[PDB]
UniProtKB/Swiss-Prot annotation, chain A:
Induction entry: Degradation of tRNA(fMet) is induced by chloramphenicol treatment, suggesting the antitoxin is unstable.
Key word Cell membrane present: no
Record-listed E.C. numbers: 3.1.-.-
Protein name, entry field: tRNA(fMet)-specific endonuclease VapC
InterPro entries given in the database record: PIN-like_dom_sf (IPR029060), PIN_dom (IPR002716), Type_II_TA_system_RNase (IPR050556), VapC_family (IPR022907)
Keywords: Endonuclease, Hydrolase, Magnesium, Metal-binding, Nuclease, Plasmid, Toxin-antitoxin system
Naturally occurring in which organism (per UniProt): Shigella flexneri
Occurrences of domain PINc (ranges): 5-122
Gene from which this protein is expressed: vapC
Subunit relationships: Forms a hetero-octamer (4 VapB and 4 VapC) complex with antitoxin VapB. The complex binds 2 different sites in the vapBC promoter, probably via VapB dimerization.
Free-text function comment from the UniProt entry: Toxic component of a type II toxin-antitoxin (TA) system. A tRNA-(fMet) endonuclease, it cleaves both charged and uncharged tRNA-(fMet) between positions 38 and 39 at the anticodon stem-loop boundary. Does not cleave tRNA(Met), tRNA(Arg2), tRNA(His), tRNA(Leu), tRNA(Phe) tRNA(Thr1), tRNA(Tyr) or tRNA(Val). Overexpression in E.coli inhibits translation, leads to loss of cell growth and degradation of tRNA(fMet); these effects are neutralized by expression of cognate antitoxin VapB. The VapB/VapC complex probably regulates transcription of its own promoter. Ectopic overexpression in E.coli induces the YoeB toxin, but this is not the cause of VapC toxicity.
One term of GO molecular function: magnesium ion binding
Coiled coil: none
SUPFAM superfamilies in alphabetical order: PIN domain-like
Annotated Mg(2+) binding sites: A7, D89
Length: 123, 132
């Protein structure tokens, strides 16, 4: 039973070192960011290989109609507040909220603005 | 059955009947079109930020019921990451959401229908059409 959705930065911290098993997942949106980071890195093949290994340990959730609907709502509400958030961060927030998941992030201030969204900082 | 993935602006053009050539072609192709859930997100955002959220939301719901909504999955994400990295290398970036639609389409072997096409024409393995 899934309890957490790890933000992209948390995935990176976990990989680089420098917690729960079976209860964690990522949005497919975070996978996209991870792939982009590896491929643009100095060692793309090696870093891509690492990501396949990371992904095999957690669930990757498809970004579905529910995730999209929550995201659209969040984006409209944020715009009203003058509260900017990254486009992908907004999608991860919506996905998490759509799934009743805790979003784990080292940016608890950025995701704090999404109403109905619980956050933890494992940094 | 699915052959096209409609970009967000094309959906809007279809809904508004402006330019009316898009809806014309939309009707030619019933049963062969879909959208990414990413586009649904953009559509919902547009409704909810408007002055009449409930009415515009209903419009989106009515439109979407006529086409398939595909979930943005691991393959879509992976093609997107790669497309994004390649555009970056070439120094020709595109909007954050647009590239996700491009990646979703390529991951599914679909034609992406869009009023741009210059932004995506160079993407290998990705076919594009303009209904404007």
């Amino acid at each position: 039973h899934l309890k957490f959705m790890l933000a992209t930065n948390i995935c990176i911290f976990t990989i680089k070192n420098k917690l729960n098993q079976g209860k964690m997942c990522i949005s497919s949106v975070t996978l996209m960011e991870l792939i982009y980071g590896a491929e643009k890195s100095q060692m793309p093949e090696r870093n891509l290989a690492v990501i396949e290994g990371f992904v095999s340990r957690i669930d990757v959730l498809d970004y579905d109609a529910a995730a999209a609907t929550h995201t659209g709502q969040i984006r409209a509400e944020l715009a009203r507040q003058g509260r900017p958030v990254g486009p992908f961060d907004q999608m991860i927030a919506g996905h998490a909220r759509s799934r009743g998941l805790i979003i784990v992030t080292n940016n608890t201030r950025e995701f704090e603005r999404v109403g109905g969204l619980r956050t933890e900082d494992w940094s």
